[PDB]
Write a structure and sequence with these properties.
130 residues; identical protein binding; globular; alpha+beta; EC 3.2.1.17; disulfide bond; 4 helices; Lysozyme; lysozyme activity; monomer
Amino acid sequence: KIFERCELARTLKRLGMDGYRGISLANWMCLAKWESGYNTRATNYNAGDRSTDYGIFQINSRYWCNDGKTPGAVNACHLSCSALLQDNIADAVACAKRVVRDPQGIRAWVAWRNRCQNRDVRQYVQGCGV
């Protein structure tokens, strides 16, 4: 599913993402926008290290979910990567929370540093009622 901006903002808010570990909703929206264009089915194979990024947050298989085909990979979110390809983003949100509980926080995603860090991200939640 490819979410519309405001519907995603509220969906994320209902799931407890607003201010989770100090991360605003606007930051999560900026992340999802740049990672997948708000697409839960988004996928990207990294031929360099044989891993794959899954879903709306493009979570990587090497450390976060199990796809059975990434060498020496672990599964920190304890989920099949398939769970990150559902229209319902609850499991993806649970995993994204797991990622940010680590030292780096939202910085785990390089795309967040590239396109959201020290940026005016207000526009992502404006008019959404969140």
